[PDB]
Amino acid sequence: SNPSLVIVSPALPGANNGNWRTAQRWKALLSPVCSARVVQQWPDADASADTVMLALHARRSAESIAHWAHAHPGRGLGVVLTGTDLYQDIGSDPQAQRSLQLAQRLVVLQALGAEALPPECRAKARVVYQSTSARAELPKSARQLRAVMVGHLRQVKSPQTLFDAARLLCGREDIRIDHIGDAGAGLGELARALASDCPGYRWLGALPHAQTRQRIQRAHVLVHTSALEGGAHVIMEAVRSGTPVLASRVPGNVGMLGNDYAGYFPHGDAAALAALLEACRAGQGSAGLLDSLRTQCALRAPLFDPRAEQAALFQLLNELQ
Ligand SMILES: CC(=O)N[C@H]1[C@@H](OP(=O)(O)OP(=O)(O)OC[C@H]2O[C@@H](n3ccc(=O)[nH]c3=O)[C@H](O)[C@@H]2O)O[C@H](CO)[C@@H](O)[C@@H]1O
Structure with missing residues (x-):
């Protein structure tokens, strides 16, 4: 039986x-x-x-x-x-x-x-x-860099790292950051205040799963700062959409993306994340870091x-x- x-x-x-x-x-x-x-x-x-x-x-x-x-x-x-x-x-x-x-x-x-x-x-x-299901990889525009982080706001996701990185880039209009996730710790009020000071950052709130995967697929990069992960859904969703990732160097993330991945930053190091976002943007005018990451992510896709x-x-x- x-x-x-x-x-x-x-x-x-x-x-x-x-x-x-x-x-x-x-x-x-x-x-x-x-x-x-x-x-x-x-x-x-x-x-x-x-x-x-x-x-x-x-x-x-x-x-x-x-x-x-x-x-x-x-x-x-x-x-x-x-x-x-x-x-x-x-x-x-x-x-x-x-x-x-x-x-x-x-x-x-x-x-x-x-x-x-x-x-x-x-x-x-x-x-x-x-x-996860795949989504076809979209060709994307070289005229600006659009980043997305997806995760309901809990301290474990360390949204402050994205907050601070966004601020370090408050003055760049060619770099855009969208944040998807429920308010979930008072971190919502921090996102609203950020959004007002830095128009390049947007907190979209929670979004239904279909629209979320669409935005992951449309973005140039997924950003993921969590302090720890069992193996985050949002990272494979990006990988299986052809969207590369920048992630905090934590075992949960490194197990997903690979030991030799070139898109990690030390956890909570907002400045290291802003510089990765800058290097990704710089590479669109020129293979840049974006395509290296994409090559590496395509090699991870079968895992999921x-x-x-x-x-x-x-x-x-x-x-x-
Ligand atoms: C330990 C940790 O930190 N997270 C774990 C948590 O998942 P956790 O829920 O924390 O985060 P995950 O990225 O794994 O999953 C979030 C899922 O909700 C979707 N989403 C989220 C917000 C939103 O606004 N709209 C939307 O559609 C995301 O696409 C994703 O599919 O349990 C999972 C196992 O069950 C693990 O794989 C995760 O590693």
Whole structure:
């Protein structure tokens, strides 16, 4: 008999964020070989038919992870390290550390993620790069540089780095920056004030996923400053659109873009990001940095094909059964 998979995701049904997107897409991808359902907590009324658990975020789903582990000791449990659990919580949070213990498998969303796990947990760690649909790569104009950052405003995304970079460039009309993401910490008020002082910066608020991918595809560069990432959706969405990236040098980003990528800046170093934006703009009048990055990003694009994520999921599913 086919397994009955239950995905635990802390996102609210229908929400437009990474946690919901992973869960829905994993459900669609595993449905050829198993019955799949997504819940916010476990157990529930239908819990006794479940045979495999895939739980997102070792701390936020901790109580559901522990209920499963106590209900099925030694069998069927995979814990997915979404970012903040892995680069924050497992250093000191007791529940985060418990879920690492109890899991049969540990899923990290890029290659560098197991490095951040304790050594006794690496043997059961598994990499599942995420996937996304492609968009055709558009030729873009050389007359100005348009940059986009996408992420609901949370401190973990370090929007202050984009804020400060925008200011360093307050006086350049040939460089434009659009910021997509809900207000989400008072960072909204900081974006409105920036937008008023520097007309080259625009905070678009939250945008539905289709329009967001369109703007990623239309922009010259995606910018991503996060202090930590499990493996950000927005970066593969750019890569699979032919839109290169500039990103903070953090393991979550470096696992996605490559160890040798030429588009990193030290995290929170706003000046280093402004200079990358300047070098990208300078290269349009002349191969410049933009095309180097694009060449490097085209080499990363196959990592985010849906057939490859499903194959990784299939094998993980066998191992939990
Ligand atoms: C740890 C961290 O810092 N982020 C993690 C978080 O995703 P998190 O939600 O933080 O950020 P992601 O980039 O991964 O996902 C955001 C998704 O929402 C969409 N979007 C966002 C704002 C908006 O206004 N309009 C819109 O459509 C983006 O295109 C993207 O598809 O959990 C994911 C796994 O579930 C991980 O892959 C992320 O690395």
